[PDB]
Amino acid sequence: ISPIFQGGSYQLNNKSIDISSLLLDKLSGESQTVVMKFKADKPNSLQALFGLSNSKAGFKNNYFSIFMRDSGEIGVEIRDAQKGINYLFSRPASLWGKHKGQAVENTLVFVSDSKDKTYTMYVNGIEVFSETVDTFLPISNINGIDKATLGAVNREGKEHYLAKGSIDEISLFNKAISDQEVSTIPLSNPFQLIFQSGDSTQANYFRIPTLYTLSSGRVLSSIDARYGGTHDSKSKINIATSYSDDNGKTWSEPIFAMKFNDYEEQLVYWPRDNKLKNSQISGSASFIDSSIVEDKKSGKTILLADVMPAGIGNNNANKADSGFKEINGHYYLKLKKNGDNDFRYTVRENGVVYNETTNKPTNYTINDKYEVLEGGKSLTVEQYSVDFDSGSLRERHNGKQVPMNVFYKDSLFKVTPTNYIAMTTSQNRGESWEQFKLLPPFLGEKHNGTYLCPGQGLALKSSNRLIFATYTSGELTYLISDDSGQTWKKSSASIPFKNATAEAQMVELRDGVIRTFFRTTTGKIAYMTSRDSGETWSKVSYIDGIQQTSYGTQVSAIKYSQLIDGKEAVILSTPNSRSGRKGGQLVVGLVNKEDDSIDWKYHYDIDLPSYGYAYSAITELPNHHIGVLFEKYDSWSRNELHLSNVVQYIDLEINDLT
Numbered sequence: 001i002s003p004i005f006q007g008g009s010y011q012l013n014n015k016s017i018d019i020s021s022l023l024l025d026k027l028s029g030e031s032q033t034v035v036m037k038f039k040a041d042k043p044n045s046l047q048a049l050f051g052l053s054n055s056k057a058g059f060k061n062n063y064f065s066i067f068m069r070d071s072g073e074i075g076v077e078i079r080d081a082q083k084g085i086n087y088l089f090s091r092p093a094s095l096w097g098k099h100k101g102q103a104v105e106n107t108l109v110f111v112s113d114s115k116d117k118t119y120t121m122y123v124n125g126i127e128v129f130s131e132t133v134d135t136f137l138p139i140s141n142i143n144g145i146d147k148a149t150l151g152a153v154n155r156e157g158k159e160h161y162l163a164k165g166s167i168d169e170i171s172l173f174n175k176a177i178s179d180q181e182v183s184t185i186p187l188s189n190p191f192q193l194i195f196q197s198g199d200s201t202q203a204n205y206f207r208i209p210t211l212y213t214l215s216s217g218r219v220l221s222s223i224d225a226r227y228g229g230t231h232d233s234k235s236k237i238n239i240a241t242s243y244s245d246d247n248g249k250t251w252s253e254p255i256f257a258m259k260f261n262d263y264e265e266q267l268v269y270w271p272r273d274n275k276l277k278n279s280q281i282s283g284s285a286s287f288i289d290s291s292i293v294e295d296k297k298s299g300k301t302i303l304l305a306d307v308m309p310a311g312i313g314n315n316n317a318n319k320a321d322s323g324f325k326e327i328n329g330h331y332y333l334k335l336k337k338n339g340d341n342d343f344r345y346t347v348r349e350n351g352v353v354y355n356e357t358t359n360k361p362t363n364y365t366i367n368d369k370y371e372v373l374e375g376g377k378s379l380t381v382e383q384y385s386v387d388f389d390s391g392s393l394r395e396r397h398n399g400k401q402v403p404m405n406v407f408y409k410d411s412l413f414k415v416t417p418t419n420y421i422a423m424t425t426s427q428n429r430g431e432s433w434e435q436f437k438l439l440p441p442f443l444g445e446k447h448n449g450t451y452l453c454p455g456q457g458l459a460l461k462s463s464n465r466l467i468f469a470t471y472t473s474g475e476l477t478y479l480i481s482d483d484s485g486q487t488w489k490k491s492s493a494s495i496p497f498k499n500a501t502a503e504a505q506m507v508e509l510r511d512g513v514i515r516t517f518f519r520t521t522t523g524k525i526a527y528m529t530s531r532d533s534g535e536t537w538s539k540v541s542y543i544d545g546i547q548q549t550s551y552g553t554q555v556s557a558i559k560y561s562q563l564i565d566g567k568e569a570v571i572l573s574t575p576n577s578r579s580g581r582k583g584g585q586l587v588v589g590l591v592n593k594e595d596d597s598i599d600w601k602y603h604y605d606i607d608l609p610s611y612g613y614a615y616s617a618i619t620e621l622p623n624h625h626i627g628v629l630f631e632k633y634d635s636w637s638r639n640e641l642h643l644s645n646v647v648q649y650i651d652l653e654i655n656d657l658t
């Protein structure tokens, strides 16, 4: 249907615009849709874009508004004091402010549906909330509405929630338009989605993006496909990948690089209320924090990620146990059988389950998928699904049998409840992945494994050496392979932090010279340098000119192929804020060839200093543009958990940065 009202080119300069005479007598029936294209690159702390109100004395709580915050949050209020209704629906991190130094036109669609008693908000093609209520309040059925306002809400004759911005287009319809119709509305987005709710992963949430440019020109991305909200492990999380063959313009439907089947792959709307938001899937195995490298020699793509057995995360992982037993020079995965109090088994060569107590082999084997076989026959367990039907999180058997895996809760043989690192490879540049293999322990029998640094591994340009940074208490532990990832050794580098989440990413400044940038607990990004391809490492220094919070955020980094201002360039991606995960920047550093010091010369603001920016991935695309895949929200904040479609991709050119 056509709109009942359509207007545009409204400048909101801290002074509301009255459109009552144009709009109010057009509103009819109980269902409405608002479509608004607007910019706000300098918003006030809290501002209303659109209002319908009773402006009379004594009715200050009788209004409908669409409002936004300078955090990027969008919402509505629907209030009628006589009816005793005060609805407030919102979602943080729903907006864009600026892109390449120009105000972004956001496309907002709000649907108020009296038949289904549902209010739904979309911004930039993304559904940010949908709420059904028992008692529906039609937005123009508020008692005594007499004002329709842009850029404020008129309460008792005065302008509340004054806005700074512009409304380039606004249309209203006397209908609740369908989800289908909504998808036909043209967008002006500065970003793309690679992974998204409803795609092949069936995860409603994503965190921990990676990007890596392959020698063929294909660009590969990996990510945590997070099912149980945005919570870290313990949860259900798989590792998913997608690639682009056209410099990031289009992306393939995701596949899994690493997945477990003990719990169903469910798209769930995780509760965001204060009573339930900490609900966490507690009996599932998971993968978390992936990293990618390409090996020139074999041509293989290699992906590592952490592996968590059922119910395990970084807080409950046994720090005093590697999960392997050393038996005369070699490491074997330990197992515990149903009914035993101790781990009396190991997995030996060709997956043979061996009884340590009587030194006898059993009739059980572990296959390449870490599944349990008895006499060559596959054992199974019943799968779990999760629901909130009862008003709290329930995890329950769903009738489906899946192969019995030693990382599962229901398995006959169970691994040590600690954290592991696994590796998988692809021979077809991400079209398919092999079954993963566990890496051996590097810090001994009675030390839990290190944690992989998400993002990229490093393929040294002048050799066959591959390095993945990892972290643990008191050091970075670099994992080094010179044989296409068949065998690994560690190189340890002490850091002056205990229990830091020291997520580290590397750039090769010149042949054999590696600088590693890493997250600390000091509010400053740190770095160290190797001049012998990772064998030995310098002391730790800090970057001035960038701020992080006390808890820190992952930082991504690449060595740009082209000179900038006649110099070798490194590009860092990080939030720049001492307050939260916001104020995203790309920072271009120029290398001084005399001492390898870096002059951090240009800071490019990804979006507003107040808008969210957390973990990130950056890569030089084959056409020398820069691709950035990043968490566009505060992934630390307890107010911004469980948001969909906030991991987003943008394309930048060096000219945009400098």
Ligand SMILES: O=S(=O)(O)CCNCc1ccccc1
Binding pocket: 232, 233, 234, 288, 289, 306, 313, 314, 315, 451, 501, 635, 636
């Ligand atoms: O809290 S955050 O800084 O956003 C993310 C930190 N994830 C650490 C982790 C790594 C591996 C397993 C569990 C937890």
